Amino acid sequence: NVRVLVVEDERDLADLITEALKKEMFTVDVCYDGEEGMYMALNEPFDVVILDIMLPVHDGWEILKSMRESGVNTPVLMLTALSDVEYRVKGLNMGADDYLPKPFDLRELIARVRALIRRKSESKSTKLVCGDLILDTATKKAYRGSKEIDLTKKEYQILEYLVMNKNRVVTKEELQEHLWVFSDVLRSHIKNLRKKVDKGFKKKIIHTVRGIGYVARDE
Template sequence: MRILVAEDERDMNRLITRTLEKEGYGVDSCHDGDEALTYLESADYDAAILDIMMPRRNGYEVLKRLRSLGKETPVLFLTARDSIADRVAGLDLGADDYLIKPFDFDELLARIRVLTRKRSTHRTSVIAIGDLRIDTGSHSVVRGARAIELSSREYAILEYLALNQGKVLSREQIENHVWNFDYSGGTNVVDVYISYLRKKIDSGEGKKLIRTVWGTGWMLKEDA
């Protein structure tokens, strides 16, 4: 999952970014509204966290412009302004959620999980493909009775494949959703991580769930 964090308080921005990265999200961050729009217009994010009181362009203006472009990126507003009028204004512009500062990071993560689920067909925290179970809340992965330990990057790729099960995802799509703009890329880094996942998910199993579509990409799919 790829998330944009637009927060002008630099210490807060770093804390949010590090927290999300530890959870396996690909994160881009910026400090004003104009930067936020540039990022949002340039990439397809699974969610955006916008501070309302940002320089150059506030969060309301960013959201209004985003929606006028037809982009349905889920947006969570962060603000110290807790009046009902402020919340109503944000929701009326198309915000999906609202979190008042100061906030608990566990609550922020829970709200992000809800927002990212809105972009998929899954409405619970558990995704099932055959005997594979992926819990997007706890980031736990089980196949049959076997618990599978994954790194944060391995989990992020697996979750992205699972949320798009049955669809072929290209190398570029996986890079764009799991890594951020600072990622310089590599000719086979995605291939390497897919290999890691195959060993952990499919090794020793009769049914293989991770499929290669030669010349196109990969998908997660159960045999018919």
């Protein structure tokens, strides 16, 4: 099962995070100082580690650095006071995988944990990737930039097919044959997909070959 380590010395907050994650069926170990935190982070396998920037004995950055120095590459979510940019402008560059400045919603913390898991998961049967786009084919959800893409069900079916066949042009005819009028709406679906997947991103995944078909590209 997916394992999380929480290292946080404010015990009510530590326990809030821990129990909130347990309610979602994560397996969680909680540490209330950097001594036990460091020991767990270096010596026991986890899928994600959540550290406070401030901890007794060894602070969150110290734990993160020791992990990396020891070959433990598990993603780390650092709970902080300030944003990464705010720390960087001060001269502190921690190199954590993600940062969650206070105050935050537990919902946001859980989302950030889930994004770290999906982005770092190895070769999956139920994970498809096209560039930096991730499809969780087990739940029929799509993500990019650590954010869920709000696709309609039809949009997802089309996207999955294109991604399954990435870098190959797929015709309307091939799509029609594989998906559950059609001709008219397909262009709208693709236009909407293009907006939802590629807006704000330099690398454009959704492509159209005029009069032929569509293709999800990552080369």
